[PDB]
């Protein structure tokens, strides 16, 4: 079991498939989404493999919050001074496409309501 | 400045409360966008995620853990979407950080 698993996001964590990386630390990785839904659209993922938010453990709280802190810092570093939307998808109704926890950050245009 | 979510936290105006602890409150949105649509908000007044501090990281993660536990309790076994809006482009409606949780229908892409 290679660290991070073998979803595309685990492969990206281990530099086995390429990504456009914005920020990296010991806990997480921020990189651009290849199918962007906004002028800026990136992902913040833990390096620890968690398949989906519905199975996150209570002790994962700091790590999950760290994704949002890194997300808002990256958004500022990318000049998203008018704001942005953060999204976590869970399961089928959530539209989750990769079963490795990930925070979407979208900006550079007016986001609309409802959020899908 | 204070917001309507501060009033809800202080129990000055009603909301349909799902869950409460010493540091957050979960309640149904007054303008729901899905068959289940609730909010998880910290009791600490953080105006927007862009001004959250490093020391807030476990509190922010607590909102998500509370959110996913409430979603399971509300029967959202087919999934759901969590949303935090920042600023005007993000469509943030109240300047008190809040996590939306939406489900009970297929959520679509793009997410707004
Ligand atoms: Cu895996
Ligand atoms: Cu995704
Ligand atoms: Cu549009
Ligand atoms: Cu909002
Ligand atoms: Cu629809």
Curated annotation (Swiss-Prot), chain B:
Outcome following mutation: residue 100 to R: Loss of SUMO-specific isopeptidase activity
Outcome (variant: residue 83 to M): Loss of SUMO-specific isopeptidase activity
Outcome recorded upon mutating residue 75 to V: In NMAN; no effect on homodimerization; no effect on adenosine 5'-monophosphoramidase activity; no effect on affinity for tryptamine adenosine phosphoramidate; loss of SUMO-specific isopeptidase activity
Group of enzyme by EC: hydrolase
Tissues and organs where the protein is expressed, per its UniProt entry: Widely expressed.
Gene Ontology CC: cytoplasm; cytoskeleton; cytosol; extracellular exosome; histone deacetylase complex; nucleoplasm; nucleus; plasma membrane
Gene Ontology BP annotations: intrinsic apoptotic signaling pathway by p53 class mediator; positive regulation of calcium-mediated signaling; protein desumoylation; proteolysis; purine ribonucleotide catabolic process; regulation of DNA-templated transcription; signal transduction
SUPFAM superfamilies linked to this entry: HIT-like (SSF54197)
Residues where Phosphoserine is found: 31, 58
Predominant location: cytoplasm
Start and end residues of each HIT domain: 4-112
Domain of life where this protein originates: Eukaryota
Reactions that this protein is recorded to catalyse: adenosine 5'-phosphoramidate + H2O = AMP + NH4(+)
Outcome reported for the amino acid change (mutating residue 20 to K): Reduced SUMO-specific isopeptidase activity
PANTHER family: HISTIDINE TRIAD HIT PROTEIN
Recorded family membership: Belongs to the HINT family.
Designated name of the protein: Adenosine 5'-monophosphoramidase HINT1
Protein source organism: Homo sapiens (Human)
Gene name as annotated: HINT1
